[PDB]
Amino acid sequence: SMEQVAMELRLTELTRLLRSVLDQLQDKDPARIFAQPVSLKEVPDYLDHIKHPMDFATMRKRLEAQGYKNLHEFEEDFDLIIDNCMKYNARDTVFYRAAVRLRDQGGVVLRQARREVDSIG
């Protein structure tokens, strides 16, 4: 149907905008602390602590499969990155502090993304 195509074009355009959002958020992690999944070879107990691991490479895979239907879903995954790190790592660590700075800086980006998503539809 033409209606299915139109919905598919809207998903494609959302995917374009989410890719640019993802790029912008990941620039706020210049240490690449959140670039890849926590390695279970190197942190073998991680899944005892963190039930839903997340990282920017894993988000990028989902994004490229057009797997985010709306901005809320994408933000959920970004918040997991931050929130998982702030639980596993203590306050006095470079990891925790990196998460705080990514959260604070990414808030700005996400604020205008929400306006763009609403605006363009």
* HSE-up (13 A, CA, CB side) for residue 26: 16
Range of the domain at 7: 1-121
CB 95 within 8 A of CB 89: yes
How many domains does the chain fold into?
A: 1
CATH number for the domain that contains residue 92:
1.20.920.10
CA distances (Å), 86 to each of 20, 79, 90, 99, in order?
Answer: 25, 11, 7, 7
Cβ neighbours around 68 below 10 Å, total: 20
CB 53 within 8 A of CB 46: yes
Rg, the chain, Cα only? 16
Write down the residue that tokens 């993802």 correspond to. 22
**Mind spelling out the 3-state secondary structure of 62-73?**
HHHCCCCCCHHH
User: Which DSSP string do the residues of 27-47 spell out, in sequence order?
Assistant: HT-TT-TTSSPPPTTTSTTHH
CB 18 within 8 A of CB 56: no
Give Cβ neighbours of residue 91 (< 8 Å, ≥ 6 apart): 97
